[PDB]
Paper text:
The following permanent integration of this viral DNA by the viral-encoded integrase (IN) into the host chromosome is a necessary step in virus replication. In most retrovirus systems, IN first removes a dinucleotide from both termini of the linear blunt-ended viral DNA (∼10 kb), termed 3′ OH processing. Next, the same active sites catalyze the concerted transesterification reactions of the nascent 3′ OH groups into the cell DNA. RSV IN consists of the N-terminal domain (NTD) (residues 1–44), the catalytic core domain (CCD) (residues 50–214), and the C-terminal domain (CTD) (residues 222–286), similar in size to the corresponding domains of HIV IN.
Although many crystal structures are available for single or two-domain fragments of HIV, RSV, simian immunodeficiency virus, and bovine immunodeficiency virus IN, a three-domain retroviral IN complete with all structural domains has not been characterized using x-ray crystallography. Earlier crystallographic and NMR studies showed that the extreme C-terminal region of RSV IN spanning residues 271–286, and the corresponding residues 271–288 of HIV IN, are disordered. Thus, we generated RSV IN(1–270) lacking this flexible C-terminal “tail”. We have obtained crystals of the three-domain RSV IN(1–270) in several different conditions. Although the crystals typically grew as very thin needles not useful for x-ray diffraction experiments, the crystal morphology was improved by seeding and introducing protein mutations. Diffraction quality crystals were obtained in the presence of a solubility-enhancing F199K mutation. We demonstrated here that RSV IN 1–270 possesses the same capacity in vitro for 3′ OH processing and concerted integration as the wild type RSV IN (1–286). A possible explanation would be that the residue F199 interacts with the NTD of RSV IN to mediate IN tetramerization during the concerted integration reaction. As RSV IN residue L8 aligns with E11 of HIV IN, a hydrophobic interaction between L8 and F199 might play a role in RSV IN tetramerization. Taken together, these results imply that the CCD and CTD of RSV IN are primarily responsible for viral and target DNA binding whereas the NTD is essential for IN tetramerization required for concerted integration.
Numbering used by the authors:
A (entry chain B): 54 to 146, 154 to 204, 206 to 268
B (entry chain A): 52 to 145, 154 to 269
The structure:
Amino acid sequence: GLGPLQIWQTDFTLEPRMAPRSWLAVTVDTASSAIVVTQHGRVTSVAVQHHWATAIAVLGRPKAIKTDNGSCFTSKSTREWLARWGIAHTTGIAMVERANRLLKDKIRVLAEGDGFMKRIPTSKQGELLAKAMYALNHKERGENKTPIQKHWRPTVLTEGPPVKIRIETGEWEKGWNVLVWGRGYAAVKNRDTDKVIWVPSRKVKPD
Amino acid sequence: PRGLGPLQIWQTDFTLEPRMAPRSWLAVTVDTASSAIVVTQHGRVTSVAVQHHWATAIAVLGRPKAIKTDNGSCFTSKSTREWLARWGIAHTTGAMVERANRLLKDKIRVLAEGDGFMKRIPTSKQGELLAKAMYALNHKERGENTKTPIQKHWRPTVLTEGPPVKIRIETGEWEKGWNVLVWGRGYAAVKNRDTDKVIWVPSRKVKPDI
């Protein structure tokens, strides 16, 4: 939906260039379009949980995931696992298809770009896949945002959260932000005047 | 030895975790500013392994300007040096990653014993368990932090000029021409008001000015 970590779509897909572990578990966040890929020798019920756990480690935990129906998606094990994680499950029978195409194309390009015209040597598969991931998630997909931008909204803040401080009245005054704490003082910057002062920590509360 | 913002300086290390035998080598990288960690399993330490590991870290965290390691032969091979150079990542062989190894190993311990594995974790459960540990490390606040490591990584706070401080010189007096950019429990980054120069000093040696 309109939001990272709401609905993901997961699918398995066959990339023989990655043999013997030619099975690729693909997950994409429907809002940010961030991909996570893991490889597997066969499409088991443990592979899926491994995959999802990976993608969760990268992306965070989602409200819900859409898969097709089974059989390793509708494993007893798999449902029990989802429930353990508190992750809502949608079956059906798309966006992750598009992902499969982008992903297999990026892989063909990297592989051929390094001199391997068929099956990629096993040892180099990991790095290659990781490069695919870096490309699809970090590098612009057209004249409009990267998945990284959409998932994380990256930015560099120049001060901390807003706060109020107590002045020579007893009143709490808004219009201030925390830069650092040290030795029981907060350094604080007025966001109108750019003035910075040290204030006893007790005299500082969030806004 | 530390960055002021993410993707400046990473630290990397291989650690041995017997619970994850037979492939018990974990490559661990931590970003010195965000504290985010990336981990991968390896069956032995190699240039191939470290390159794969770093590629993985880069796909997760973005590309860093520099990486510090120890004088481990796998970081200084021809293969790895050409790799780093291709990616334009500076390398140096100058603790944050040690802390990271401790946190990682603790988490792995807790999750493994939380599921009856007091020993080697079964081979097929290793992947998921490590992924779980990585999730708990980057997507949960490290105690006193209000932000998770991943949040600090993507939306960091980087002070423009920093508030004035006195630092206890060396003789042992408080010198007054300094500003502070990062103030941790262990260490503080301070800037002199007449140079570009930023140095890391122990927090006991820094106090607010007026």
